[PDB]
Write a protein that binds this ligand. Structure first.
Ligand SMILES: [Ca+2]
Length: 126
């Protein structure tokens, strides 16, 4: 199954995401975090295939998280940014830092699941 981790400081949203993704037969939520530091700690412990990553969060933001994942971890989930902040420089930074996809809030759950499955099933070297 696709193992998903969720990082966002909106607790209600995390619960909705967890409920929906848990209802998909091919997916499982293996961890959630409410800020960037907790997200990094969660990634030390869990090895998701997919990370849903909010940007605006306390302690450490999702772009700092993205940069740390690429530089500091052996195992790397494919990351889907899921944020309200789709500012021109931020989108560009996200792709430079290794994000696999970037979805704006507000979003539809079905579209999100569609992207999860495409990103998991993705590279250029055969
Ligand atoms: Ca936020």
């Amino acid at each position: 199954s696709i193992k998903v981790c969720i990082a966002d400081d909106n607790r209600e949203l995390v619960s909705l995401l967890d409920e929906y993704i848990s209802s998909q037969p091919d997916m499982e939520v293996i961890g959630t975090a409410y800020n960037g530091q907790d997200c990094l700690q969660m990634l030390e412990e869990k090895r998701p295939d997919i990370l849903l990553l909010d940007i605006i969060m306390p302690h450490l933001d999702g772009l700092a998280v993205l940069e740390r994942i690429r530089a500091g971890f052996e195992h790397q989930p494919n990351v889907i940014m899921l944020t309200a902040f789709g500012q021109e420089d931020v989108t560009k930074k996200a792709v430079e830092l290794g994000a696999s996809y970037f979805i704006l809030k507000p979003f539809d759950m079905e579209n999100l699941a569609h992207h999860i499955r495409q990103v998991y099933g993705k590279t250029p070297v055969v």
